Amino acid sequence: LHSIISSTESVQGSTSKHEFQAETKKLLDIVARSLYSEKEVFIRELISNASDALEKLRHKLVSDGQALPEMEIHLQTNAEKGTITIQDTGIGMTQEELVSNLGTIARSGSKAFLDALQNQAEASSKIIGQFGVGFYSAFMVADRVEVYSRSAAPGSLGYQWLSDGSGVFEIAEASGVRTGTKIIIHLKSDCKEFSSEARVRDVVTKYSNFVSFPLYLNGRRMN
Numbered sequence: 533l534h535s536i537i538s539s540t541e542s543v544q545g546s547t548s549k550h551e552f553q554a555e556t557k558k559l560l561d562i563v564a565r566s567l568y569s570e571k572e573v574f575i576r577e578l579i580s581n582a583s584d585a586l587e588k589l590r591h592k593l594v595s596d597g598q599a600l601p602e603m604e605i606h607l608q609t610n611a612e613k614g615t616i617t618i619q620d621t622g623i624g625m626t627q628e629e630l631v632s633n634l635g636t637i638a639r640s641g642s643k644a645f646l647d648a649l650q651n652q653a654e655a656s657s658k659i660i661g662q663f664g665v666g667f668y669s670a671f672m673v674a675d676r677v678e679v680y681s682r683s684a685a686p687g688s689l690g691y692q693w694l695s696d697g698s699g700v701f702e703i704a705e706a707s708g709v710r711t712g713t714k715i716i717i718h719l720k721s722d723c724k725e726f727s728s729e730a731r732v733r734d735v736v737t738k739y740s741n742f743v744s745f746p747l748y749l750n751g752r753r754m755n
């Protein structure tokens with residue numbers, strides 16, 4: 533087996549509170565309404581985000597003149613805790629990105645995204661991914677979301693990022709965060725199926741061969 537996901541992180545700083553941008557909750561809601569009928573697609577959304585993070589790390593390392601490290605995407609299920617977790621070893625998120633990325637669309641203007649979603653020229657799931665709000669689909673299956681991220685940028689600290697998706701998120705420095713991003717989803721009462729290894733395998737195997745870097749489920753290679 534080849535696993536990297538474990539409960540290694542430790543809170544080692546006090547908590548900073550951040551309120552959602554005014555429109556962010558509206559956009560969270562519209563993603564959830566759009567994707568409910570195929571709610572399992574959140575896994576593909578987060579794998580796509582992880583792949584994007586690995587590509588960003590690739591280009592950093594190409595310009596740095598350095599080797600490619602273990603560049604992987606890992607899924608973990610925990611039926612006892614009612615969680616699904618995804619961890620990538622990609623570029624990770626800086627403090628500034630953890631503060632600002634959720635509200636990017638709200639701040640820059642949602643018109644283009646909402647127009648695209650309305651026109652339905654492609655699958656809603658694809659549009660949502662393309663506009664960079666695939667992470668919004670984490671919330672639609674979660675009672676709460678628990679994120680650990682550390683940027684590959686020099687001097688970057690590791691952070692815990694928590695939210696129940698309602699209107700606030702909280703950031704605290706953490707020790708033991710691997711470069712990249714880990715997202716722990718505490719699943720909603722109607723979404724417990726995604727804490728089943730068999731169910732997640734069934735869902736992901738339909739597209740796992742389309743993933744460029746090694747993809748693992750509970751330590752087992754999927755591609």
Ligand SMILES: Nc1nc(Cl)c2nc(O)n(Cc3cc4c(cc3Br)OCO4)c2n1
Pocket residue numbers: 581582585620622623624625629630633634664665667679693713
């Ligand atoms: N996996 C991976 N990796 C990197 Cl580098 C990412 N950069 C990103 O913006 N995302 C999606 C994302 C992750 C978040 C967040 C907001 C957003 Br929009 O707040 C808490 O964590 C990323 N997701």
